[PDB]
Amino acid sequence: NMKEVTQLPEPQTASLAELQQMKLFLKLLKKQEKELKELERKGSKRREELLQKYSVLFLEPVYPRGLDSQVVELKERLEMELIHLGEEYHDGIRRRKEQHATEQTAKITELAREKQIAELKALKESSESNIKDIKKKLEAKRLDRIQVMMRSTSDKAAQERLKKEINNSHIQEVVQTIKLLTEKTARYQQKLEEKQAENLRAIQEKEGQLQQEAVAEYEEKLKTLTVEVQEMVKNYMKEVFP
Amino acid sequence: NMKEVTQLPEPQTASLAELQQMKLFLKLLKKQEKELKELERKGSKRREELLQKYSVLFLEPVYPRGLDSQVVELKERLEMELIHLGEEYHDGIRRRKEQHATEQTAKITELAREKQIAELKALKESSESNIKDIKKKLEAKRLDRIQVMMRSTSDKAAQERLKKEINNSHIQEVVQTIKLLTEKTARYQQKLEEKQAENLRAIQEKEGQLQQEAVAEYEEKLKTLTVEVQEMVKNYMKEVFP
Numbered sequence: 001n002m003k004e005v006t007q008l009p010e011p012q013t014a015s016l017a018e019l020q021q022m023k024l025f026l027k028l029l030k031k032q033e034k035e036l037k038e039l040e041r042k043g044s045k046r047r048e049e050l051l052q053k054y055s056v057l058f059l060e061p062v063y064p065r066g067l068d069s070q071v072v073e074l075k076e077r078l079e080m081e082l083i084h085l086g087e088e089y090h091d092g093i094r095r096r097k098e099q100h101a102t103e104q105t106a107k108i109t110e111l112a113r114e115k116q117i118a119e120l121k122a123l124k125e126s127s128e129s130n131i132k133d134i135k136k137k138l139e140a141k142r143l144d145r146i147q148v149m150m151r152s153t154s155d156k157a158a159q160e161r162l163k164k165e166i167n168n169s170h171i172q173e174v175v176q177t178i179k180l181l182t183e184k185t186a187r188y189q190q191k192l193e194e195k196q197a198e199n200l201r202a203i204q205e206k207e208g209q210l211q212q213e214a215v216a217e218y219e220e221k222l223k224t225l226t227v228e229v230q231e232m233v234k235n236y237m238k239e240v241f242p
Numbered sequence: 243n244m245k246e247v248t249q250l251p252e253p254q255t256a257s258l259a260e261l262q263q264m265k266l267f268l269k270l271l272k273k274q275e276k277e278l279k280e281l282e283r284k285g286s287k288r289r290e291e292l293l294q295k296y297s298v299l300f301l302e303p304v305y306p307r308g309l310d311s312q313v314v315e316l317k318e319r320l321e322m323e324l325i326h327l328g329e330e331y332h333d334g335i336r337r338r339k340e341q342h343a344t345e346q347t348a349k350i351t352e353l354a355r356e357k358q359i360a361e362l363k364a365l366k367e368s369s370e371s372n373i374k375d376i377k378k379k380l381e382a383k384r385l386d387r388i389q390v391m392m393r394s395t396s397d398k399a400a401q402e403r404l405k406k407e408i409n410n411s412h413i414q415e416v417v418q419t420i421k422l423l424t425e426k427t428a429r430y431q432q433k434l435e436e437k438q439a440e441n442l443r444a445i446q447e448k449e450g451q452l453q454q455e456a457v458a459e460y461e462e463k464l465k466t467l468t469v470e471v472q473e474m475v476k477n478y479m480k481e482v483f484p
Contacts, residue, residue, distance in 0.1 A: 124340075197443070222413060
């Protein structure tokens with residue numbers, strides 16, 4: 001009934017944006033980017049190491065046979081290893097991105113679960129304080145409805161029938177205001193939990209997109225791989241002979 | 243055909259039932275029940291300790307300074323200190339009960355959290371594991387298709403065309419197959435996270451009912467409080483004078 005009696009903080013939870021802009025999360029992303037740059041360097045060095053390997057083979061003497069163009073053979077073998085490396089390479093990046101997505105969810109889920117505990121605790125404590133300060137205003141009124149009632153009557157019978165009928169109001173309106181306040185605090189805790197559940201769903205939806213972007217890129221790379229290899233092996237050969 | 247190479251662990255998380263039986267959870271329930279009996283001890287000692295006080299006051303010789311009876315002056319005063327004692331006592335049980343409710347959620351949310359992480363981890367490793375063996379089979383088939391081909395066709399230009407078609411097949415088939423598991427893994431993960439959400443929700447629902455119960459008792463106790471004391475006193479006024 002009384003609105004000043006029931007307060008309770010509004011069902012609020014830090015959003016993704018607020019969480020994604022937090023320090024601990026921002027360093028993870030920078031960490032993750034360093035991990036991707038490393039894989040790229042390692043990949044790049046590996047391609048060179050593979051090419052360097054053939055620079056060696058193409059200089060070794062070949063013993064004669066029919067179809068003795070077993071020099072074109074090596075060419076084909078190199079092309080295939082580059083393809084093999086190309087595959088392995090992009091799959092790795094692919095798996096790494098998917099891992100990053102996992103870590104970002106973990107980190108962000110943690111940072112959110114921390115704030116959420118406070119939100120919930122904050123709510124509960126607000127609920128108790130009200131109760132306490134609601135029972136004080138109610139009992140304080142008790143003494144007053146009595147001090148006054150006495151100040152205006154003297155008949156041990158009727159005088160007391162009221163003291164009895166007044167300690168009856170108290171005992172009754174406290175059970176009342178405590179219920180409604182309880183019921184209410186319960187509406188709030190639930191809104192609060194729901195907001196957090198939604199929050200998680202969005203976190204999970206973001207991961208999905210990241211997983212999805214990791215696979216698209218992966219495909220997008222294998223689309224042109226065989227041809228990028230065709231072209232590089234063509235240039236490579238010119239440097240190996242003419 | 244496909245279901246052999248795209249098989250994933252069907253979504254499943256422990257139920258609220260499985261979790262309410264784990265060691266740690268049950269020990270907590272035992273501890274919390276110890277706390278309730280201790281409060282009950284402090285509750286009784288304090289009431290006993292309050293009657294003792296009125297043993298002295300009652301049987302204390304009185305030096306008449308007026309006429310009204312000083313026994314009633316104390317009788318009613320006793321009743322109100324018991325009432326107040328009842329008010330803080332039950333309110334305290336209420337607050338502790340609800341505190342136990344917040345403790346069970348924290349605990350069970352813990353246990354659940356750990357398993358749910360392991361589940362998500364198992365699904366992901368499984369998925370990637372399929373991808374690895376898919377690439378092994380596909381590439382094994384590739385080698386074999388080439389082998390069988392070369393020995394049934396003894397014309398370069400021809401076998402080169404066939405190699406390109408076979409190699410082409412392989413690369414695209416791994417990409418599309420990796421695109422497939424990835425889509426199925428996404429479906430299995432989504433459903434999995436969904437159960438976990440439902441489970442959490444069941445948990446909060448449980449806490450909601452406990453808290454609800456903790457308040458229902460309080461209300462009840464308070465409504466009978468006035469009588470349970472006036473009577474206990476009546477019996478008391480026969481242990482003092484009569």
